[PDB]
């Protein structure tokens, strides 16, 4: 399974007027852990994209979406919004559907005009999964699904949203063999983004 070679997990949650996206930092060759600095979350303005799956495909899609969003911003003279970027990601995955990329993306951001949270995921069928509560991706998706489904509650404040998402990621990563070696959490607000590194098991 190409997606399972490198491992890693991404989770996005919605708070009250703010969004959080978090991922683990491990890059590995199956059992062997190679790097603890392979961040899987990228931003293209005020919209964040977490990509799990095959690491080469993660890098390729990061480059491709940087290209596409730079051209979009130049042509449109405006930054791409989370919904438009979700559509762009969906269409870009489709353009390679035969011989696909082995990735699961997670879009997270706040629409600048309406100013309200947005998170979306993409499944194997390629269907956009736009969720009001949380999106999980990666090897520990099951662990994350249960953890988020138990911990999440609506309208979390940013300081509570941080704690909820970080606990969900830490406890799911602890139970996934291919995930860990540190975690990073982005708290995305209307005006600012706060990036935090979490203390966690280094085995």
């Amino acid at each position: 399974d190409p997606s399972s070679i490198n491992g890693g997990i991404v989770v996005a949650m919605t708070g009250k007027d703010c969004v959080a996206i978090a991922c683990d930092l491990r890059l590995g060759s199956q059992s062997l852990g190679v790097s603890n600095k392979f961040e899987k979350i990228f931003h293209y303005g005020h919209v964040f994209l977490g990509i799990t799956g095959l690491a080469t495909d993660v890098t390729t899609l990061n480059e491709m979406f940087r290209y596409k969003t730079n051209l979009y911003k130049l042509k449109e003279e405006r930054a791409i919004e989370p919904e438009t970027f979700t559509q762009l990601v969906s269409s870009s995955l489709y353009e390679r559907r035969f011989g696909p990329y082995f990735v699961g993306p997670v879009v997270a951001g706040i629409n600048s005009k309406s100013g309200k949270p947005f998170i979306a995921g993409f499944d194997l069928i390629g269907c956009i999964d736009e969720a009001k509560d949380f999106i999980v991706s990666g090897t520990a998706s099951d662990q994350l699904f249960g953890m988020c489904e138990s911990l999440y509650e609506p309208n979390l404040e940013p300081e509570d949203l941080f704690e909820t998402i970080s606990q969900a990621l830490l406890n799911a990563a602890d139970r996934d063999a291919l995930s860990g070696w540190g975690a990073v959490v982005y708290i995305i607000k209307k005006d600012e983004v706060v990036k935090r590194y979490l203390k966690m098991r280094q085995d």
Partner: protein, 203 residues
């Protein structure tokens, strides 16, 4: 998945469940499985819209359901679905077997819940169904699939296409599986998570 189409005395109604599954895991609890091809042509399954709209603008005529059927079957043959709608020639209900073959029906069912839904359709379908009776029947077939099939769950989406008027899409027509309130609140006190680094990101 559970999808049913039910032709009634003045139109057609299609319904679906809103559960998406990654094997045994429910990825999306509220997936919308009824898709517009045109304003009055909808499809559900277990490019065509844009081409249909372009041809409608080119010919200055309302799309035929047969046009969508033909294009979709030819697309699948080049490389299951229920397509139902109303056009100047009446109401139609077609199914496409993704290898290329198509058939007409007065009531159809697709997906893993197809048999459980078809049991209800066979038991209760009759000629000269009224709009309300047909909506009730399609909802009951979807509910049978929901309760009896593991791949079907959550809510019922209904789209009603009546000949003389515009199509009405009933997102989450029934919501029989609403979750109960949790026994406890799992809100962590702030400071529960250990943080290594904190930084502001220049988005």
């Amino acid at each position: 998945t559970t999808i049913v189409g039910v032709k009634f005395n003045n139109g057609v109604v299609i319904a679906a469940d809103t559960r998406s599954t990654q094997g045994p895991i429910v990825a999306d609890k509220n997936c919308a499985k009824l898709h517009r091809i045109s304003p009055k042509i909808w499809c559900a399954g277990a490019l065509i819209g844009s081409n249909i709209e372009l041809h409608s603008l080119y010919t200055s005529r309302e799309p035929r359901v047969v046009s969508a059927l033909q294009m979709l079957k030819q697309h699948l043959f080049k490389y299951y679905l229920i397509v139902a709608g109303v056009d100047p020639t009446g109401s139609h209900l077609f199914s496409i077997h993704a290898h290329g073959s198509t058939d007409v029906g007065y009531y159809l069912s697709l997906g893993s819940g197809s048999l459980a839904a078809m049991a209800v359709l066979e038991s209760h379908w009759k000629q000269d169904l009224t709009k309300e009776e047909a909506i009730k029947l399609a909802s009951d077939a979807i509910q049978a699939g929901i309760w009896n099939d593991l791949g079907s769950g959550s809510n019922v989406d209904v789209c009603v296409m009546e000949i003389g008027k515009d199509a009405e899409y009933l997102r989450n027509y029934l919501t029989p599986n609403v979750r109960e309130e949790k026994q406890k609140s799992y809100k962590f006190p702030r400071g529960t998570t250990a943080v290594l680094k904190e930084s502001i990101v220049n988005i």
